Amino acid sequence: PKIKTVRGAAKRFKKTGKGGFKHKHANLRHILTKKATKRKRHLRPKAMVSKGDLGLVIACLPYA
Amino acid sequence: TRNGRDSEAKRLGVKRFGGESVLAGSIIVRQRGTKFHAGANVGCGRDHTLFAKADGKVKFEVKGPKNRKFISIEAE
Amino acid sequence: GIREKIKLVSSAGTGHFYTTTKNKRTKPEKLELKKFDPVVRQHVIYKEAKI
């Protein structure tokens, strides 16, 4: 049988050009009044998955 | 009553020692107070982190009438 | 645990708003400040409203 994608991972990681994965930052869903604007601003752009975590992502997204 | 609590270490101290070449913005020393003071081409962050405002070599000096330690960047 | 969260709505037509805290027991008066509105790119006055 085909490998099944972890659908939860597919909704959180997008494959980039050179094979990396981009993802949205955490800590930007709720309580935000107490967070400094500088901190919230640096969490808006998408980030690349670190080298230590690529093994977990690739295993979960075999067809990505 | 009972002990057993502590906080995580903060990794303070000197990051670039005398003579080291640094880029602009490099953190030189993290400190709680101003154990070291900002000299030439060196800024003082809100937590009194001393960072290089220009490229060059860091330099430690003791100056002033209170013999305070200053850190400056010999621009090169 | 007394300070309540409030929002400051811009006096301009835009729905932009800031958020802050306030001790409504000691300071019952509404908070009014001049803050930058990034929609109209001007410093307008912001008035208090419920979160």
């Binding site: 939860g8 991972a9 909704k11 959180r12 990681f13 993802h23 | - | -």
Partner: protein, 96 residues
């Protein structure tokens, strides 16, 4: 994805975005594919007949990829400004 009980990476990160149903019916065409077509004039039907785009493609865009050498008449296709120059440079013609 199991990390021993710690909240795994694909669960401690937020979900984002949505899937566009229009992107599934849109394709990109390289300049090097304009010569594979039959007849010179290219459109949706001629590209599908040449097995260049899918049968369900409704929108197609020509981009500056590869190279075109013969005069080609592009019809009913969006063309990037870089590909538009290259097509006109080879005596081609672009019509909406």
């Amino acid at each position: 994805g199991f990390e021993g009980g710690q909240m795994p990476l694909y669960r401690r990160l937020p979900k984002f975005g949505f899937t566009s149903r229009k992107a599934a019916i849109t394709a990109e065409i390289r300049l090097s594919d304009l010569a594979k077509v039959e007849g010179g004039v290219v459109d949706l039907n001629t590209l599908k007949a040449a097995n260049i785009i899918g049968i369900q493609i409704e929108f197609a865009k020509v981009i500056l990829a590869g190279e075109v050498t013969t005069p080609v008449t592009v019809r009913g296709l969006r063309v990037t400004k870089g590909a538009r120059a290259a097509i006109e440079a080879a005596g081609g013609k672009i019509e909406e």
